[PDB]
Amino acid sequence: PPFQVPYVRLDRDRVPTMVGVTRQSRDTITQPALSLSTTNTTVGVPLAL
Amino acid sequence: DARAITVALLSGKYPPDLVTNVWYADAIYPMYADTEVFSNLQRDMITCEA
Amino acid sequence: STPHTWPRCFMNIQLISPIDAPILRQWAEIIHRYWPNPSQIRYGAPNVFG
Amino acid sequence: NIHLFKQLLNTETLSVRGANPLMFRANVLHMLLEFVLDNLYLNRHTGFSQ
Amino acid sequence: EWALTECAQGYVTVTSPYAPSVNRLMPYRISNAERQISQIIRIMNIGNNA
Amino acid sequence: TVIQPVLQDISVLLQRISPLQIDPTIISNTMSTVSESTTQTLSPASSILG
Amino acid sequence: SANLFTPPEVLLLPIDHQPANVTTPTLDFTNELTNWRARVCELMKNLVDNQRYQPGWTQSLVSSMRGTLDKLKLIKSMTPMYLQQLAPVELAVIAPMLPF
Amino acid sequence: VQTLVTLVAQISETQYPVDRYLDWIPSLRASAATAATFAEWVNTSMKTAFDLSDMLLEPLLSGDPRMTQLAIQYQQYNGRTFNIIPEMPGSVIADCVQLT
């Protein structure tokens, strides 16, 4: 199924720069909202035309 | 060689049924059964005398 | 390739001299004013497909 | 019935009539898992007779 | 019927009976939560691999 | 020549007594990248595996 | 004791040590080695995002670079655990037995 | 996924709330390797029961599963980040094994 992030015409400030997923948590953190920023794995790949 | 050390640092694992007490008892038993400390002590005493 | 590398003259058109480089200024303002505008369209049958 | 409690982590147990006590909880948990799994069926209506 | 008609944007019309059915079992509706979970799983094993 | 045998033997003794096992397949599975028939890979995963 | 420049009953280490405990979490950033690896990976990340230092890359390798660095940072190997807990014990056991 | 986390919670310590009726049965000190092996066994059993041949949970199975969690985020150039954490729904298998 589709998976998109918003398209910005020329507003540089809103250009996406990282998409990350997590599959675990750090040593003591138990709340995903807190460990997400440091336990994420960047995802993406360019394709040539 | 840095490469070997890095590989060792990134690819370590334990046996999935490790019990430290049993493992280390088995490890120590023959090592101490084949000790040579006492002969070394006697040799050291001879060396100082000489 | 990254947003960090956008040249300052590109976001601020005035930096390009209308006299020393008219073609580049024309091209920049054309890009700013006529680049396609994104939009969106509804789809799907959420009541069953989620 | 010892063979039902030595199928997860008893890869070191030399004797075929022995099992490691420390694996008992893991083995029991596994056994319960497939106990549930093997019973995932819908009871069917066959037919009767007076 | 409604879902298929909606998905095709009206270009295709399907029909369903209007009668006392025999309450067949067709389990296909799930909450959005597990759809998102499965989508995350699908994304997580595709990263950086053209 | 005097010192080398001592270090080599001690290193072997550590290797044969530690529970730690070195297994690069951990690295290989974590990367999980093949990229067959890529004359110009220019991919970080392939280079780091190399 | 054959110690010369050290107190007779002590053995020096270049790494801090902790009591042995197998149940330790892998991603325990308290461990110095794991924290070091995380710091190095984060530094390389911060180096590579904005492409300020890699001109002449035709394609934006930022995503793949960051993904690889994240995989290395969070690789769940058990070597630092062993180095922090078990290895000093083995060294302490062996040392008095050595001929030298 | 939920069945995996529930079963692993019994032999190791995790962050999710969970009941415990098998504490009187003796058990070892679970390590990362033990957890990985247990998770692999669970995955194999689940795949067998439902007649699946392709991958299931292997994306999770890499390394230590004792602290699994699912979330996804993305970041703009200006630093604003957006998180999506799916609030994990129920499970009949986990509840039934809990009852058993």
Side-chain angles (χ1 to χ4, degrees), chain A residues 1-2, chain C residues 43 45-46 48-50, chain E residues 30-42, chain H residues 86 89:
Chain C
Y43 88 103
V48 175
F49 292 162
Chain E
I30 55 160
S31 166
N32 305 290
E34 51 266 60
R35 288 212 79 195
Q36 303 192 311
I37 298 282
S38 58
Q39 174 80 338
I40 286 188
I41 295 313
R42 213 158 309 141

Side-chain angles (χ1 to χ4, degrees), chain D residues 3-4 15 18 20 23 26 28 36 39-40 42-45:
Chain D
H3 74 263
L4 293 181
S15 168
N20 195 310
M23 313 318 127
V28 167
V36 161
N39 266 290
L40 291 203
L42 290 187
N43 292 331
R44 191 149 198 74
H45 168 86

